[PDB]
Amino acid sequence: MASRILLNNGAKMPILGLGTWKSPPGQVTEAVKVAIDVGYRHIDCAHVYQNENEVGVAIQEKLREQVVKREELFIVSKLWCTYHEKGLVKGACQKTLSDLKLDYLDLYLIHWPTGFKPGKEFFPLDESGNVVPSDTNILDTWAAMEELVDEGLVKAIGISNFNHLQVEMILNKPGLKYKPAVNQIECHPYLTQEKLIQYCQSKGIVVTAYSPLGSPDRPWAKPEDPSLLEDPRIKAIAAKHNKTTAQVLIRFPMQRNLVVIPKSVTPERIAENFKVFDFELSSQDMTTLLSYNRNWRVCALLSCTSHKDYPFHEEF
Ligand SMILES: NC(=O)c1ccc[n+]([C@@H]2O[C@H](COP(=O)([O-])OP(=O)(O)OC[C@H]3O[C@@H](n4cnc5c(N)ncnc54)[C@H](OP(=O)(O)O)[C@@H]3O)[C@@H](O)[C@H]2O)c1
Fold first, then answer.
1. What separation in Å is there between the alpha carbon of 250 and the centre of ligand 1?
2. Are 160 and 186 in contact (CB under 8 A)?
3. 49 is known as an active-site residue
4. Closest ligand 1 atom, residue 23 Cα
5. CATH number of this structure's domain 1-316, picked from the four choices 3.40.50.620, 3.40.50.2300, 3.30.590.10, 3.20.20.100
6. CA 265 to ligand 1 center in whole angstroms
7. Given CB 3.0 to 4.6 Å as the disulfide criterion, which of 64, 113, 163, 190 pairs with 309?
8. What is d(CA 46, CA 76) in angstroms, rounded to the nearest whole number?
9. Which of 234, 263, 312 to mutate to test the pocket of ligand 1 (most atoms within 8 A of CB)?
10. Which of 55, 96, 191, 215 to mutate to test ligand 1, by most ligand atoms within 8 A of the CB atom?
11. Would you say 82 is a known binding-site residue?
């Protein structure tokens, strides 16, 4: 297991990164500092997480400390849905750059294919509680992303939560200048994603797996929901290999040629989670983990199920 995967922009991306969704602002600076100290070189961020300033304090401090060089870090952020308009993309990217203490991002993603009405509210509502769409489509937002590459603000651009028909729409865009480098999607043993992965990889698009542990701290968790970290079938594979269940859940996507971004703010788990380059799951282990699929999503964007570009009506 090599630590980096080659993207279709010619740059290399670390296959393990640290997630930051739900990381409290008073904990995430120390989480990112610890992560860099114990070997992480990739941090997954987003403006909608409301903690980029605090992530940036950690990055800046480790660059100033000369723990790492900027060229050795791979920092990812995402354009939120209320900024899909031509005239707002650059300022959204630049706010993220300012917050993160950076002069460029390694990768900038369209967070979801759905554009929303611009304004202060991240989920603007009509009176009856529906999210209010933007009329701007994925293709014009993609052209705005391409301009960020050509202005030096981002090294790579990509997409997130795009279904295969939406990836195809990008790839078939008239006058396409840069292909997406990455599609970041939910992926774990309960949502194994073979078709969408198979499609993206066949096109040279690297897939990043989010919520690889099943997001036990997701805000809408219900007790009756399945639990990867407690699944005795997965705990058995981990015991066989003398690893934790989380380490198996992180190694799994790595052996599918995916990038994976487990989140923690607990120092011991941050270190735990990185110690996944010294063991191999067998093919039988991999097939067995894949067999647990049940099409279960942490992130189903339920307020947006009538948006024209809602991604999860399509089989994949
Ligand atoms: N593109 C998108 O739309 C999108 C959507 C969802 C997620 N993401 C990205 O993917 C990242 C990861 O997904 P996620 O945050 O949903 O969830 P996750 O990484 O699947 O799970 C995070 C949870 O697992 C716990 N945990 C971490 N390591 C553990 C270990 N070794 N043992 C036991 N528990 C452990 C964490 O607790 P503590 O933190 O308390 O240690 C936290 O409660 C996000 O943070 C975000 O960066 C992107």
1. 11
2. no
3. yes
4. 39
5. 3.20.20.100
6. 9
7. 113
8. 8
9. 263
10. 215
11. no
Tokens of 3: 């630590």
Other beta carbons less than 10 A from residue 296's beta carbon:
16
Cα of 285 from ligand 1 centre, angstroms: 23
Please pick, among 49, 83, 178, 190, the residue that the annotation labels catalytic: 49
- CA torsion angle 89 265 289 281 (round to 10): 110
CB-side neighbour CA atoms (13 Å) of 140: 12
Please identify, by atom number, the ligand 1 atom nearest to the C-alpha of residue 112. 3
Q: How far apart are CA 305 and CA 129, in angstroms?
A: 12
No. of H helices and E strands in the chain?
Answer: 10, 10
CA distance 258 to 184: 10
Give CA–CA dist 112/122, Å, rounded.
12
Question: Is 250 one of the annotated binding-site residues?
Answer: yes
- Known binding residue 161? Answer is no
User: Technique behind this structure?
Assistant: X-ray
CA pair distance 153, 141, nearest whole angstrom: 16
115-140 burial, b at 16+ Cβ within 10 Å, e below that, comes to bbbbeeeebbeeeeeebebbebebeb
Q: Provide the 8-state DSSP code for 205.
A: P
Q: What b-and-e string marks burial along 60-86, b requiring 16 or more CB atoms within 10 Å of the CB?
A: eebbeeeebeeeebbbbbbbbbbbbbe
Q: Where are the domains of the chain?
A: 1-316
| Residue nearest atom 32 in ligand 1 by C-alpha distance | 246
Nearby residues of 297 by Cβ (< 8 Å), 6 or more positions away: 186, 191, 312
H helix or E strand, kind and range, residue 13:
strand 12-14
Which residue in this structure is represented by tokens 């699929």?
A: 293
Rounded to the nearest whole angstrom, what is the distance from the C-alpha of residue 262 to the centroid of ligand 1? 5
